[PDB]
Design a protein around this ligand. Sequence first.
Ligand SMILES: CS(=O)(=O)c1ccc(-c2noc([C@@H](CC3CC3)[C@H](N)C(F)=C3CCCC3)n2)c(Cl)c1
Ligand SMILES: CS(=O)(=O)c1ccc(-c2noc([C@@H](CC3CC3)[C@H](N)C(F)=C3CCCC3)n2)c(Cl)c1
Ligand SMILES: *[C@@H]1O[C@H](CO)[C@@H](O[C@@H]2O[C@H](CO)[C@@H](O)[C@H](O)[C@H]2NC(C)=O)[C@H](O)[C@H]1NC(C)=O
Ligand SMILES: *[C@@H]1O[C@H](CO)[C@@H](O[C@@H]2O[C@H](CO)[C@@H](O)[C@H](O)[C@H]2NC(C)=O)[C@H](O)[C@H]1NC(C)=O
Ligand SMILES: *[C@@H]1O[C@H](CO)[C@@H](O[C@@H]2O[C@H](CO)[C@@H](O)[C@H](O)[C@H]2NC(C)=O)[C@H](O)[C@H]1NC(C)=O
Ligand SMILES: *[C@@H]1O[C@H](CO)[C@@H](O[C@@H]2O[C@H](CO)[C@@H](O)[C@H](O)[C@H]2NC(C)=O)[C@H](O)[C@H]1NC(C)=O
Ligand SMILES: *[C@@H]1O[C@H](CO)[C@@H](O[C@@H]2O[C@H](CO)[C@@H](O)[C@H](O)[C@H]2NC(C)=O)[C@H](O)[C@H]1NC(C)=O
Ligand SMILES: *[C@@H]1O[C@H](CO)[C@@H](O[C@@H]2O[C@H](CO)[C@@H](O)[C@H](O)[C@H]2NC(C)=O)[C@H](O)[C@H]1NC(C)=O
Ligand SMILES: *[C@@H]1O[C@H](CO)[C@@H](O[C@H]2O[C@H](CO)[C@@H](O)[C@H](O)[C@H]2NC(C)=O)[C@H](O)[C@H]1NC(C)=O
Ligand SMILES: *[C@@H]1O[C@H](CO)[C@@H](O[C@H]2O[C@H](CO)[C@@H](O)[C@H](O)[C@H]2NC(C)=O)[C@H](O)[C@H]1NC(C)=O
Ligand SMILES: *[C@H]1O[C@H](CO)[C@@H](O[C@@H]2O[C@H](CO)[C@@H](O)[C@H](O)[C@H]2NC(C)=O)[C@H](O)[C@H]1NC(C)=O
Ligand SMILES: *[C@@H]1O[C@H](CO)[C@@H](O)[C@H](O)[C@H]1NC(C)=O
Ligand SMILES: *[C@@H]1O[C@H](CO)[C@@H](O)[C@H](O)[C@H]1NC(C)=O
Ligand SMILES: *[C@@H]1O[C@H](CO)[C@@H](O)[C@H](O)[C@H]1NC(C)=O
Ligand SMILES: *[C@@H]1O[C@H](CO)[C@@H](O)[C@H](O)[C@H]1NC(C)=O
Ligand SMILES: *[C@@H]1O[C@H](CO)[C@@H](O)[C@H](O)[C@H]1NC(C)=O
Ligand SMILES: *[C@@H]1O[C@H](CO)[C@@H](O)[C@H](O)[C@H]1NC(C)=O
Ligand code: NA
Lengths: 728, 728
Amino acid sequence: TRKTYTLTDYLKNTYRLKLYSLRWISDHEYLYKQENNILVFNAEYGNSSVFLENSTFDEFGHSINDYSISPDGQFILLEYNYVKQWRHSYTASYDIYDLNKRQLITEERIPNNTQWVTWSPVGHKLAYVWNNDIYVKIEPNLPSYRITWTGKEDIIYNGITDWVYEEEVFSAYSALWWSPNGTFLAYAQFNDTEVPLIEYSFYSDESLQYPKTVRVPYPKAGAVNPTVKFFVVNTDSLSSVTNATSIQITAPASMLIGDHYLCDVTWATQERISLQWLRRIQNYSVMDICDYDESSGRWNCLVARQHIEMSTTGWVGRFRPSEPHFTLDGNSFYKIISNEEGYRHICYFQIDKKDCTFITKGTWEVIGIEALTSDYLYYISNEYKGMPGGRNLYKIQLSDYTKVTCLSCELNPERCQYYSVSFSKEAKYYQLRCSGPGLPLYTLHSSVNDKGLRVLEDNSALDKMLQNVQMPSKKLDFIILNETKFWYQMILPPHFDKSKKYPLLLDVYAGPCSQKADTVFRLNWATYLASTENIIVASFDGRGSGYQGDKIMHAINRRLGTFEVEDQIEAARQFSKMGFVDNKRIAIWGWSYGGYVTSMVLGSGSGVFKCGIAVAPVSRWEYYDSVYTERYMGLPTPEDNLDHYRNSTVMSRAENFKQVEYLLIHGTADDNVHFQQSAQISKALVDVGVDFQAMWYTDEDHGIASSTAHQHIYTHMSHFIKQCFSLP
Amino acid sequence: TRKTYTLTDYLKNTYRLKLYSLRWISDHEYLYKQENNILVFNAEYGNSSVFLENSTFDEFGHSINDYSISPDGQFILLEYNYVKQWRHSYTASYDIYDLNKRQLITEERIPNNTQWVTWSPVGHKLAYVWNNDIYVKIEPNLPSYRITWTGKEDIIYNGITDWVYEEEVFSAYSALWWSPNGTFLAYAQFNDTEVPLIEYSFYSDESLQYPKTVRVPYPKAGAVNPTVKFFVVNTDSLSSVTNATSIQITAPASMLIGDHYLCDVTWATQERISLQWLRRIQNYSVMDICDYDESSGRWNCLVARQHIEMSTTGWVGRFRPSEPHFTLDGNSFYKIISNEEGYRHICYFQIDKKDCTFITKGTWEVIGIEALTSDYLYYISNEYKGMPGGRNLYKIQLSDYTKVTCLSCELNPERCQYYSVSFSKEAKYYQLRCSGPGLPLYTLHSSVNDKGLRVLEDNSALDKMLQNVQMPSKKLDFIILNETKFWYQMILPPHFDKSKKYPLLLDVYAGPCSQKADTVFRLNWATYLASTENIIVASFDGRGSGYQGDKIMHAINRRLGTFEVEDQIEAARQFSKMGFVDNKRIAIWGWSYGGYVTSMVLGSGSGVFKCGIAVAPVSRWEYYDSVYTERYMGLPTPEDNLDHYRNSTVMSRAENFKQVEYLLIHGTADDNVHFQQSAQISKALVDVGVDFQAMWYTDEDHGIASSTAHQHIYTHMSHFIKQCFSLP
Ligand SMILES: CS(=O)(=O)c1ccc(-c2noc([C@@H](CC3CC3)[C@H](N)C(F)=C3CCCC3)n2)c(Cl)c1
Ligand SMILES: CS(=O)(=O)c1ccc(-c2noc([C@@H](CC3CC3)[C@H](N)C(F)=C3CCCC3)n2)c(Cl)c1
Ligand SMILES: *[C@@H]1O[C@H](CO)[C@@H](O[C@@H]2O[C@H](CO)[C@@H](O)[C@H](O)[C@H]2NC(C)=O)[C@H](O)[C@H]1NC(C)=O
Ligand SMILES: *[C@@H]1O[C@H](CO)[C@@H](O[C@@H]2O[C@H](CO)[C@@H](O)[C@H](O)[C@H]2NC(C)=O)[C@H](O)[C@H]1NC(C)=O
Ligand SMILES: *[C@@H]1O[C@H](CO)[C@@H](O[C@@H]2O[C@H](CO)[C@@H](O)[C@H](O)[C@H]2NC(C)=O)[C@H](O)[C@H]1NC(C)=O
Ligand SMILES: *[C@@H]1O[C@H](CO)[C@@H](O[C@@H]2O[C@H](CO)[C@@H](O)[C@H](O)[C@H]2NC(C)=O)[C@H](O)[C@H]1NC(C)=O
Ligand SMILES: *[C@@H]1O[C@H](CO)[C@@H](O[C@@H]2O[C@H](CO)[C@@H](O)[C@H](O)[C@H]2NC(C)=O)[C@H](O)[C@H]1NC(C)=O
Ligand SMILES: *[C@@H]1O[C@H](CO)[C@@H](O[C@@H]2O[C@H](CO)[C@@H](O)[C@H](O)[C@H]2NC(C)=O)[C@H](O)[C@H]1NC(C)=O
Ligand SMILES: *[C@@H]1O[C@H](CO)[C@@H](O[C@H]2O[C@H](CO)[C@@H](O)[C@H](O)[C@H]2NC(C)=O)[C@H](O)[C@H]1NC(C)=O
Ligand SMILES: *[C@@H]1O[C@H](CO)[C@@H](O[C@H]2O[C@H](CO)[C@@H](O)[C@H](O)[C@H]2NC(C)=O)[C@H](O)[C@H]1NC(C)=O
Ligand SMILES: *[C@H]1O[C@H](CO)[C@@H](O[C@@H]2O[C@H](CO)[C@@H](O)[C@H](O)[C@H]2NC(C)=O)[C@H](O)[C@H]1NC(C)=O
Ligand SMILES: *[C@@H]1O[C@H](CO)[C@@H](O)[C@H](O)[C@H]1NC(C)=O
Ligand SMILES: *[C@@H]1O[C@H](CO)[C@@H](O)[C@H](O)[C@H]1NC(C)=O
Ligand SMILES: *[C@@H]1O[C@H](CO)[C@@H](O)[C@H](O)[C@H]1NC(C)=O
Ligand SMILES: *[C@@H]1O[C@H](CO)[C@@H](O)[C@H](O)[C@H]1NC(C)=O
Ligand SMILES: *[C@@H]1O[C@H](CO)[C@@H](O)[C@H](O)[C@H]1NC(C)=O
Ligand SMILES: *[C@@H]1O[C@H](CO)[C@@H](O)[C@H](O)[C@H]1NC(C)=O
Ligand code: NA
């Protein structure tokens, strides 16, 4: 009898998914890490050579965390002493190695504790942030030029984001953007002077006698937000003037009237940059297109080139206004926007004309624009077979929009339905990455004829291994509610027999624009639960979910904690009505937003669920950050949406928890969803005399991803689920 | 057929013990609150009168928390707006009512947020502390005189103790001491300038958007300690024109050579005060006796009147040097000190003589000196029947030490074996308070011939109720370990049948000088466990325990976490050998020091315990405060006792928890044993992959005593124990 996929298999990663991460260094070459060393591959023929021997830095005296080659291939940036901060931010040390002279630069070294470093897009200039100030080095071994002097820990951030901009606006720590050929360096400056601080203890190693209090500028809903300014400096003038002038580009009058955000920075040409601003009430956005004025050394944004993007049904963009993709001459651009039917499609804009032209349309959506050449635009969409959970690459002819070719749909339709892509520098080649429903498959293709060049990694080794394992199956389908299709997926135990009643676990997230039902292949906790414990693990995408139009996504506008919670309950009823579910054993669990929904569902009094697990849940929206929360909830004030803010808390439903078994878990060093959120849930439960299970994870953050904690939480959760389902 | 004592009975206080808390106001009368009416009783005849009507303040507009009548009966201090701080400290608002003119004083009233207030010992002067400074009021309606001007939150404390002195030295917030007739007001001043602060989050009500960070000067083991100064001010010569002049009494040179503490202040006469100082290495203490000089107006402390107290086997005193009891003329005093055999007995001192004479002796100990007259000294001891867990009142003839009379031993030997006492002003009368083994019994007595005047409260009402309940019994006995007898107690289920096998829960504290095996009658969680769940609850006093001499108490000197932990395992091992114990179901639980021992036991690898619960445990001594920790452990420096500090942590034993079920609980706002201690235990268990149960209590402190949290913790622990023992 074949073994099953056990908890230990998951926690010990015995069945490893292989991938193929390459880094394009030009239009026909990419770097690949093999046998600890770095190889350089010729895309056209597949032949390679050693770029950097694995023994090159054996006497470096430091474990290299990552590397980065300068655009011109003359230098390599070595990163070590890596110290993680938030989701994207971290600090590290850096050394620059001269590839030609094959030596390690020892003079004018990048400072230790550098917050961010980046090569110019061409050549080998460097810009880095240290102590919250920007510095530029024209040459790796020469002194750097300081660009800002206002940097101040936790107060003024130049070239880097503060907590909320990192997490909710830029999805990145860096806040600097080199112009195309590297002459200009643009950057943002954030001022958190009046932003309140979240404070929590960090215990550290046992040796630390007094706990440390971590303090970070974090604006909760309705609180004082950081303010922002934008500047551009001409780096080519640095060696000619004592102190190069940072020219400020001010936000438009429509934004200055109130609180706002800088939400996108995109260079169009060597002397043209585009900026998008968003009002704190996120349903109004403005894009300025600014040109350099060689006679005044200033930047001017003509109102005739300003574009407005607003929404009457919700917020602007999936999570923020989309980025523009400019044609070479910078006189036009393509951008994903919601059409009149509420579906996100590609619109073609002339920079000085306010009306755009949609080049795609249909009851499906464009996920992202991947590359633009003089003749073709490549994008990913979920058009294929009307499956919102699938992803494919398409190519559209710019001289004839009726000519759209799907480049990935038919490559291997049974094994591959979810693709992402990586183009070379000038889009001459592209790597396709299939992630499901079958085992991931990585392939290389030539753009000139769209012919497949070869298979990079097919995961044959893993396929061989899984053959001797009783793996579960996955079903992706939909149910019709109110004349609208809503998709779900189910991880089914091996030898699934529809004539039997299986216990069911609803795996939920359900936040705005989320998608938990898709064609991706995963090896996770649900895999073990279905394979070894014979539990059906389901997920449902209801109102508020993404990639299916604004009608479904904006259904929860200003009303978080309502329809997305209710639809999760309704989904459980629908599943039980399918006949193979044991109504006495229906549980629910989720992490983060999923923790919130789980908690709201368990406290609804529905009677449908027996038990549930909430990990790092939100419990009241006023405790979460402003940028994310206000996007969907507006402001927590009596004149705006305070009433719904107060009505959608987990705490107000404490009394209903007497009807269920609950396990609440939270990391004490969660800088994102503060431990405070679960601290208030537990106190409310204690106040109404409700017994429940709890677990805090010392010094773990929102991901509770440290190796030991990860193994510990899933083990603890498994025992809880097995007990609730009366499983041996 | 009849009901048992249930968990609800314990949590809802269904069966309440009646008390009789009286307040002696003279040598013949006492105050007693009845029906919200303060009555005055005549001890000789038992007749009473109403002293203050419950309706006297029906329109006061504030809920009175407590009252305090001036010594002369002319005024009554009304306490309201009570806000608790630490174990003894709190702030409140006060109003003074004139009992003669039946009027509430409205002029020059005590400020709100007053930290401490106290009437002079005679008359009606008042002294209070506000904003860390001392004020004196000669008359209730007159302006107060400012005594100190250096008070500063968390830095300089005048007349009140800082955190560590409140908790570990004075067991009080007050640091003010009126002379016998109220002429002088002595006070201490604490300086915490360089004492590090413990910081932790306080979440508050749900409405608080950002958690608050509480910061308390708290010296952990080996850290910088607060410094102290002592002053005496003449309150009869205060000037409304000039600032009061405080006279300082400096500590002796043998103390000034390094860190030290002020540990006792006791007035001897109207013009003589005694102070005891303790070195930071708590095995050397010095008592100074100081006399006021009318000429120079200074206080002089003759070296000839100095008394040294040291210990070679441990620290000085049970928790600190004992207090002296001076004779009327103040020329000699009695004090409890450890004799040559290591037993605490009463020594008689001459103020100018170095050698003191022991007036009691034997293999038992004097617990405390209760009253002193020219002919007799009254004291409580555990001499009777050689039972260290019993307490009786004795009097010894001062002119012939061979004449010792037990005054409570034979009153009712079956019902009463544990007494405390309260004497009237000149010891003319005394109230005896019997607290076990039968129901509490309060009686009043006359000293001249030790007549038993009357029964004040006999709890006959509770006795009637308990008749219809299957109550557990209590067995108190001993076992021998190396020629030494160690006592234990067992709470046995109703209808105990020695032929049956019962599961057993070891209830432990085991800190230095602790006593968990005694003759006290208690209605607690253990009562329910024995009565309703049929669980035997045992407690054992091993090495390190008190009231049995230094050989036993000092056995753990510089070695916490060793013998007291090993002796609990040994006792359990022996209990398991008994025919009525199910060796497969033995558990252990403890709170505070008991949580530490419970954890150390469960991590010992003994295999004797199936499960255990630790509530607010200490986990490593370097995290606990200096005064208590160093008393037993010396300093955590390599030259002193660092190795043992590092060997006695719970964390180093994590691996051994793999074979036991463990439940770890802790309040997040514990200012005493910081949450940090449990946060490090959990992290260590996670680190070695051991599963366990946990529960944090939001905003609860060391007592986890708020009404809802109290019910919730005991409910949660009951489920855990029943589960561990497989009980319905
Ligand atoms: C359905 S799922 O694949 O598990 C999934 C998981 C996470 C998200 C997600 N949505 O916002 C965010 C984060 C934004 C990042 C920039 C993306 C967001 N800041 C966050 F962590 C939250 C936790 C509780 C409330 C919001 N993550 C989404 Cl939409 C979907
Ligand atoms: C045996 S028992 O009745 O449960 C019991 C309970 C408490 C104590 C006790 N010993 O020190 C203390 C406290 C001192 C106060 C002045 C009394 C002490 N500061 C404390 F809270 C500790 C908690 C962990 C380490 C010590 N309490 C003792 Cl000796 C015995
Ligand atoms: C892949 O193989 C080709 C064929 O040998 C290599 O092509 C060389 O290309 C350079 C131009 O950069 C010519 O000067 C040479 O004539 C070619 N090689 C030889 C030996 O003549 C190519 O360098 C290889 N690429 C990698 C990454 O190994
Ligand atoms: C960051 O913003 C703060 C405003 O909150 C600025 O501080 C003010 O600066 C002005 C001008 O000097 C002073 O008059 C005010 O007293 C300051 N207010 C506060 C609250 O500090 C600060 O100058 C800004 N910093 C930068 C680099 O822009
Ligand atoms: C380089 O130029 C900048 C801009 O003028 C200088 O920054 C200003 O410094 C003055 C005084 O130090 C402040 O009052 C201004 O608030 C600063 N403005 C900005 C935008 O930062 C900077 O000091 C100059 N550096 C040197 C070395 O001269
Ligand atoms: C990168 O682009 C910049 C901006 O267009 C170029 O700099 C300009 O060069 C022209 C000459 O072609 C001059 O007339 C302008 O004065 C320059 N402008 C500025 C702001 O410097 C630059 O030459 C380009 N770099 C490269 C390597 O081609
Ligand atoms: C409390 O005791 C003090 C000190 O013995 C008394 O004050 C002394 O009283 C005598 C006689 O009246 C004076 O000659 C001394 O000069 C006083 N000494 C001081 C330091 O004041 C005081 O009278 C007593 N108070 C009461 C109420 O008995
Ligand atoms: C009080 O206790 C201290 C500490 O145990 C004793 O001081 C010394 O302690 C060190 C260890 O820290 C030993 O090596 C010494 O032998 C101890 N004595 C001396 C003189 O250094 C001290 O002896 C104790 N005092 C009394 C009166 O017993
Ligand atoms: C207790 O009863 C006695 C009488 O036996 C009361 O009497 C004493 O005090 C009265 C007022 O203070 C006087 O009027 C009596 O003369 C006096 N009697 C004696 C023998 O001295 C006494 O007040 C009562 N005490 C209380 C508190 O009620
Ligand atoms: C409280 O104690 C501090 C020392 O901890 C006293 O200040 C002293 O220490 C300072 C460091 O914080 C030094 O800078 C000062 O020179 C020193 N003070 C003097 C007079 O030299 C402080 O004065 C104390 N406060 C009181 C009221 O005694
Ligand atoms: C301490 O606080 C109380 C309550 O505020 C003060 O009493 C007055 O309270 C009324 C309303 O209850 C207010 O209008 C007054 O402002 C308060 N003060 C006065 C003088 O009336 C009380 O006075 C305060 N105590 C002290 C010493 O200031
Ligand atoms: C590169 O180094 C690895 C280990 O550091 C070694 O196994 C391998 O042999 C080296 N590469 C080649 C091509 O030999
Ligand atoms: C970085 O820090 C290391 C260790 O402190 C030191 O040896 C090195 O010189 C530093 N380098 C720079 C550029 O500061
Ligand atoms: C933006 O949102 C606010 C709040 O709902 C609303 O009052 C305003 O009319 C909206 N603007 C647009 C263009 O929809
Ligand atoms: C005082 O009020 C209480 C109510 O708590 C009442 O029981 C008592 O009878 C009252 N006192 C008198 C003398 O009636
Ligand atoms: C008393 O001392 C304080 C503090 O130095 C001072 O402010 C005040 O004026 C003094 N009062 C008199 C009467 O000297
Ligand atoms: C005596 O008993 C104690 C425990 O009571 C034990 O630690 C010790 O080893 C025994 N032997 C001696 C000589 O003390
Ligand atoms: Na009597």
